[PDB]
Curated annotation (Swiss-Prot), chains A, B, C, D, E, F, G:
Positions of transmembrane segments: none
Species this chain originates from: Satellite tobacco mosaic virus
UniProt name for this protein: Coat protein
Record bears the keyword Nucleus: no
Keyword Transmembrane helix attached: no
Subcellular location field: Virion
One GO CC term on file: viral capsid
Miscellaneous information on this protein: This virus depends on tobacco mosaic virus for its replication.
Amino acid sequence: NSNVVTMIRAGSYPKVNPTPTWVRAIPFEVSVQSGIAFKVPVGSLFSANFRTDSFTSVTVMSVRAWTQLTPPVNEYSFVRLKPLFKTGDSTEEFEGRASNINTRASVGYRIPTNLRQNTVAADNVCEVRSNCRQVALVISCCFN
Amino acid sequence: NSNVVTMIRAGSYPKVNPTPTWVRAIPFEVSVQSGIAFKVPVGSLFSANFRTDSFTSVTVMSVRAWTQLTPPVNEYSFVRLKPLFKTGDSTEEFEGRASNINTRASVGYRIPTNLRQNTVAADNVCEVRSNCRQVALVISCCFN
Amino acid sequence: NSNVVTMIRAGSYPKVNPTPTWVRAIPFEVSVQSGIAFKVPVGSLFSANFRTDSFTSVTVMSVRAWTQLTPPVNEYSFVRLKPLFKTGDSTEEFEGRASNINTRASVGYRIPTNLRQNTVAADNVCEVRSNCRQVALVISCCFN
Amino acid sequence: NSNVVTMIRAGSYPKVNPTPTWVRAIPFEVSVQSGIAFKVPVGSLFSANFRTDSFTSVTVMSVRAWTQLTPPVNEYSFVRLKPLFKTGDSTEEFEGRASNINTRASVGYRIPTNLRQNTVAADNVCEVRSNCRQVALVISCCFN
Amino acid sequence: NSNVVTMIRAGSYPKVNPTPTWVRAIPFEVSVQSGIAFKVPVGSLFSANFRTDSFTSVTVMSVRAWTQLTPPVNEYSFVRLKPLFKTGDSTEEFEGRASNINTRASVGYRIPTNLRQNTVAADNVCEVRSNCRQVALVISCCFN
Amino acid sequence: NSNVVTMIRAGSYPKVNPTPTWVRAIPFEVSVQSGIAFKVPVGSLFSANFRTDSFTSVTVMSVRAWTQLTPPVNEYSFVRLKPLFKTGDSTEEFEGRASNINTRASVGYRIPTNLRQNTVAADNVCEVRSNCRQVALVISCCFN
Amino acid sequence: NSNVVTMIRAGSYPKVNPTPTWVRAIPFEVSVQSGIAFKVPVGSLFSANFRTDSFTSVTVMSVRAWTQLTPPVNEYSFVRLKPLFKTGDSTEEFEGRASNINTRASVGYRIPTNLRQNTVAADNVCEVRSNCRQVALVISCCFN
RNA sequence: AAAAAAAAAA
RNA sequence: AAAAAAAAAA
RNA sequence: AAAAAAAAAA
RNA sequence: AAAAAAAAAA
RNA sequence: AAAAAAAAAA
RNA sequence: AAAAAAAAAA
RNA sequence: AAAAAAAAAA
RNA sequence: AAAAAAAAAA
RNA sequence: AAAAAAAAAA
RNA sequence: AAAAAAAAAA
RNA sequence: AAAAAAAAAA
RNA sequence: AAAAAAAAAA
RNA sequence: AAAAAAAAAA
RNA sequence: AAAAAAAAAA
Ligand SMILES: [Mg+2]
Ligand SMILES: [Mg+2]
């Protein structure tokens, strides 16, 4: 390959976009209480911590969750996800449980193409339930 | 395809990165004076206007330039690029000229793999010369 | 095949969901008045009569309608469907007519993937018009 | 694919059923005492918690069990299942044991076609034995 | 081919629709001010001038824009499009620039299937920015 | 497929037409008297009820007719069509009869390419005769 | 297949045996002391608990052992098996050790065809040694 | 990958 | 997938 | 290995 | 016959 | 399955 | 798809 | 056309 | 020779 | 293995 | 050249 | 059409 | 894609 | 013989 | 020999 700078025979000015879209896998944690569902805010996806503070909308594709702290004594960890949507919330409770007391419980869900619209900060992604005080989420989405 | 939310049989917690790299084509303009070279600052690449204010380093791959305003009376536009490098500046003057007085002049250069290291805000990319008061640049780079 | 109970070499605890989705064909009737459009409520889809009272949302895929009572004297039955959507109602009037005075008139419409979002009890599916006092609907949908 | 609503050339009124059958995997827990067998009631399968309260009968296909709490000190978890049938109870004691003290014990059994008849709330599925105070069951069945 | 009228052996009365959908490419202009974004109203798509006054909803598929008047002295034309959506506005600024001062600048964007829902008169399609006082749009859509 | 908005590399301004042609199947009814021919006016094809009020001309391709009300006592329905043309009316009487007293009679005719010219509101399509007080027409035409 | 009882064209009285042989995998536990070998009695294989109380002889094919309780503090479990035979005891000490302190240690041995003779209650199968107070055995044998 | 239940298509 | 024991079929 | 987003090449 | 949802198997 | 009209792609 | 009547073409 | 029940044949 | 139950192997 | 009667499927 | 919408044919 | 970055699948 | 000049490799 | 830099051609 | 109109057949 070349070891020096070389000329580029540029043509006309191209189509440009200073603020493009971005497909990402965003990791963040949420605090969870015993027997109570926690509504995950879409606003958590927009942050300088993820280089996404310039976005105001996002299209969520999938959600994965893991328990982030140990479970109560004698128990195995569990985590549940209930998808939420502006056009109508679901009543599914996708659940994962650990089979070793020292291991994380995990589960996830995919959003179908027909339900992949935008969401803003004030919207919620899903409800999280667990016997662990913290849950780690990894959300696959398209910032736009 | 599916019309409803479906379960994802998630496994162990994956490797994650909240602040990934980003390959981009960044468009911006610079002011140019007659007979004077303008040093293009790398700092112009880091801005909320490009969603890149969270980065402090960038690896430039190629630089393309176009005249952005009309040339002086009776003249055809021209633009020249002189690559700059922290390990030693080049003396090449890659030039493009218009063949129609109403059209932009354009030129570019590719940086070879061996010279693709990082640059920070205080560094300069290249020197620009033109008979036009403004030059539009489109820089292909890897933010990291 | 086996005539006795046999062991299952079960492994780790699986992913579970006590409240899954359900693809259905829901039959119900609506009362219709001469020259007046009847707005079909989505709420009619949630009922113990269909085993769907545990759901609060549904994604409608297609709607089919049949006249359920005889038409006025000297006439042939007819039924019209006008799709309704939260993002904007349609002005289509899909119509079917009977070709035998003693036979039902029928028609239907398919909702495209891009318009297959959720609906809740307070929403309406479509407007029904007919010269018959009752119309029988069969709605293909995904409860979630 | 289509982006708009389209007509369906519906024919005669079809055969319908407002209350269909449903093949499911039902997860629930039972409390177990040391040295005592717990009779699992079929009634636990009918609940609004599973969207099955509209059913009064079910055909069980298979039963899987996991210990749901930690075992006594110095021990490895174990779980046993004894199939029960209205025409004659079995004396099999299908057992699983953990090989790591921190892991669940698991086992299951399949019901042969010849023994797949209906069961009602007052009937029992099987007897559960364990050294753990709770057992998690996942029953594969056909609600009708 | 036949030179006279011929009989058609018609059967039963067909399914009919007096008010069908219509796929179109709608051309219209908007006034634009220096440094200010113009919100393009969906209402502009419904007009007797396009034979679309009978529609109240439309599904936009793509938007293309061209500068419609000459740019300021010494400049090249430019046009920018920022997609707007009821579920969340985008922050993309798709841009085109002219490479000849006497030529139009142009750009466009495609709406993905998952975001192709209906819009009504009060909704907005996108924001337009330009250095030209007028922009000509051609919107590909499905009236319904 | 894409889940986000994407750029379109638009070129020059295309050829456009705000008021295009439209191929349609138009359904409407006419009142018919015993032993009297009813001249079907072309004007009935132009109406807001069909989204065609912006057109003033139409090219008819084919005409189909069905009896729309029951026939007199003891009789079977019948319908006759006599094509009319500005350059010379036909004397054909294309006829259909029912073979069941409760069923519609139907018939149609195709206009040959050589006779497919435009017609305006004041023109007539055909003459209708029937023993039924109403006839339902479905006219295949090209609005222009 | 048949849904009713059907005739069997039986012939002469067959050879019969009310008390047949049985190939089994028998699970049972033994108590073990630190630094002391435990002689496993063959008599443990004959019990109503295994449905084998009607047998007085058995041919052992293989022996597998697992530690059944946790090991002493700071240690990994271990289990050793020394085969015993009426014609001459072996001096082999087949051993397994755990590689995780929370996991069972396991080992086994196969008896060659030439040493597969019968054993009665008063005979011993093998000697067991372990640092765990209990060992779980699974013996593959032929009851006769 | 096949099969069973609900749905859709053919 | 083959083999051994019980059973069934051929 | 294919696909989607950004980029580059053709 | 294929596909989508629940389940089962591989 | 082909064709005509509107649209999109190539 | 073939044939018969009128017409046209070859 | 195959299968199940009764019968017949082989 | 195949299948079902228990076991073993792969 | 085919056929006849009843049934089921196609 | 394929596809989507309206129409026509098969 | 291939490749690089982010993502998804296998 | 080939060739000429400088360089590198073979 | 291929490749890299400058040039030329296609 | 094909096609168009009327008829008949398939
Ligand atoms: Mg009848
Ligand atoms: Mg471990």
